[PDB]
Ligand binder design. Sequence first.
Ligand code: HEM
Ligand code: PFZ
Length: 405
Amino acid sequence: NLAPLPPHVPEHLVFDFDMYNPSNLSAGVQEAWAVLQESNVPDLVWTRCNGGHWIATRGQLIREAYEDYRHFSSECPFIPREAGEAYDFIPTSMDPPEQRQFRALANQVVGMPVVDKLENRIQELACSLIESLRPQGQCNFTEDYAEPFPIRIFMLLAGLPEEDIPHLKYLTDQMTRPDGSMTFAEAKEALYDYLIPIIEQRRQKPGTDAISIVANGQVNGRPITSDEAKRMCGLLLVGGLDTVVNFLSFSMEFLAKSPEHRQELIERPERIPAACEELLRRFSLVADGRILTSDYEFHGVQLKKGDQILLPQMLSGLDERENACPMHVDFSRQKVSHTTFGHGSHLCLGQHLARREIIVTLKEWLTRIPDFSIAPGAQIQHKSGIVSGVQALPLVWDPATTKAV
Ligand code: HEM
Ligand SMILES: CCCCCC[C@@](O)(Cn1ccnc1)c1ccc(Cl)cc1Cl
């Protein structure tokens, strides 16, 4: 289902990529996207899928676009347009200078100092979850660890009941990897119906949770409104529920297939941080975009006001001009170049938390379960969207090769 080509698009720039269902999805999600970086593909293409939109394919262009908020606005950051239209999360749907105030607040909640405070709990939950799995010689990593781990940490931070997980997770999944079961706005609404009462409650009787801090915060000398808190909290929710969860699965799928990479980390633990960055490059998973604010000629292509452009954060690090042998995992790369956490003014606030969660998982998993693999005859399915994911991750191991701590 392709849309008719707008008058301003040269037919030689057409490349029909479906960000929701790329063609060689079988090969893996990062591999499916990397088709865009083949020699036959121009740096900047137009796809007729998902209503028609530009896609920058090279790291240089993605970064430039990301820096350029004047021309590339966050007002409508998701494709298809109706999704980008319906989304009003803060600070994501704002451009500087306005963004800055909201950012400053969200930072209060997720930032470095918070992670530092939460460190022991992160370590505590990881150890507990792993130890619980160890003796079984088999899990569903996606349901068994990748979900509970990051989610429970978020739930704790946000001061929300664990019981709400299944419902929230569903709504979140609808936003990034739409199923066809709702509509973006419907999804957004359901999430907001959830949040409203909680916010009201935390305005009246504040706590120490993230929601309380956002609900009662200051923005540009005055108090945040109820609508604004709702909108910030909505973003925090998607970030907490849908990001780290998918990343861990890609990473774990790779480790399960590469004994030598596992060993490397076991013997030379000083490499973990470095390996964390490398995996963030190779298994990058986010793709969003921007909206043209005016007619603008970018790298010789004419962009028209209102055109949307996908600037796949995923792609920068997979770009050969950025990293030699992109698809190869090397923990000793001299320079790991990625924009996994974004670029420009919208740099991920939650990066510190995400990194802490990754490093803890690697260290702790390898400590206890040094030797594992994918279950025989299991076919791993990746899913594409705004955030890409792994459907399920059947792992097996010999309990006798594990180590209790
Ligand atoms: C592996 C994990 C994650 C990845 C790859 C990731 C990626 C990104 C990307 C690419 C952006 C910028 C989007 C844009 O420019 O439109 C973003 C922004 C953001 N992320 Fe994340 N994120 C992750 C985890 C988290 C977590 C755990 C949270 C916290 C709950 C979080 C909170 C945020 C916020 C608040 C922003 C908006 C910053 C702003 O607009 O100023 N993220 N993230
Ligand atoms: C229709 C869009 C579906 C919801 C987007 C999810 C997320 O907000 C959360 N998140 C992600 C990272 N941190 C929080 C995101 C994903 C990718 C990008 Cl590029 C930006 C944003 Cl805001």
